[PDB]
Design a protein around this ligand. Structure first.
Ligand code: A1A4R
Ligand code: A1A4R
Lengths: 160, 156
């Protein structure tokens, strides 16, 4: 099960390092500018493992606002043309290993196997975050399957 | 639940699969401009990856960047014994960091078992990728030591 290794590397090599300092970085950015960024990192977990080049390409209601200094991005979520939210948002990039594996014929890794590992990656990550207090309170995982679909709506639901 | 299977598949599919088919042309270009046609990957079974590769041995001196891979001159008794593209298997840093994170309940004995599994799984992956296995060499080692001598043995 490749998902156990992917979830442990994602946490130990990245989330464990950025989440304890994210609250101070968002507080600094909010103090700098008089509009306010929500205090957590929203992680997009598309269960299809499709990670685009730019997050803004997935929905025209997700506009790039700015980079959070000290590389994370802030986005404004739109609902009917109005600014419905502002947050630090990004994809769970280790999902790209599962997508690439599903296209590499020699791996013998089907789209059914890919969905099973994408789900296992999300479950293993939430098991890891359960034991890390400063990390579970500084991030929110947004797991989704596409059925017609609005990613900004999916994010907005979690924000509220 | 072994982390090594995920670490070896990501190392190959997200990095080696992309750089190894174009490495032979990059080394031939560099040689024409101004050696050794393979990527030598250091796999310390202790999972210790230093900040700079040159800190692990004074007989491993940085030569240049391959137009990010590094070229190094290996020394034996002060003389240039070899020139190759060398780098560590960076996913081993997950295993080392896991072994220092209390909540993981991942011992140094568990870490050695996963470092070995990572090399075995990566060799199994490279066996099925022809253009990748011909353009890369895995140097797995346990420190009891000369890293330059360990690399030089594989070069020959
Ligand atoms: C080719 C594409 C589609 C563009 C792609 C892009 C990124 C990834 N990665 C992952 O899945 C990943 C899985 C676990 C931990 C960290 C990561 C990285 C990440 O999350 O960015 C990254 C990655 C993989 C291997 C590496 C590496 C970085 O650094 C050098 C050594 O080997 C994979 C693919 Cl397939
Ligand atoms: C803190 C230190 C000691 C400095 C550290 C440094 C590097 C790693 N990585 C790995 O072990 C690794 C494992 C499998 C595939 C790719 C990699 C990367 C690599 O090989 O460089 C890298 C990594 C991990 C997670 C990531 C990521 C990159 O990109 C963003 C999303 O999550 C781990 C640690 Cl613990």
């Amino acid at each position: 099960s490749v998902a156990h290794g992917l979830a442990w590397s994602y946490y130990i090599g990245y989330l464990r390092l950025i989440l304890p300092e994210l609250q101070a970085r968002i507080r600094t950015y909010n103090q700098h500018y008089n509009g306010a960024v929500s205090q957590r990192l929203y992680i997009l977990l598309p269960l299809d493992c499709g990670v685009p080049d730019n997050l803004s390409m997935a929905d025209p209601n997700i506009r790039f606002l700015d980079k959070l200094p000290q590389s994370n991005s802030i986005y404004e979520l739109l609902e009917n043309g109005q600014r419905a939210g502002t947050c630090v948002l990004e994809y769970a990039t280790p999902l790209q290993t599962l997508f690439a594996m599903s296209q590499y014929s020699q791996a013998g890794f089907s789209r059914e196997d890919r969905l099973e590992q994408a789900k296992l990656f999300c479950q293993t990550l939430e098991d890891i975050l359960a034991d890390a207090p400063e990390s579970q309170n500084n991030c929110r995982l947004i797991a989704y399957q596409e059925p017609s679909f609005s990613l900004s709506q999916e994010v907005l639901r979690h924000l509220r």
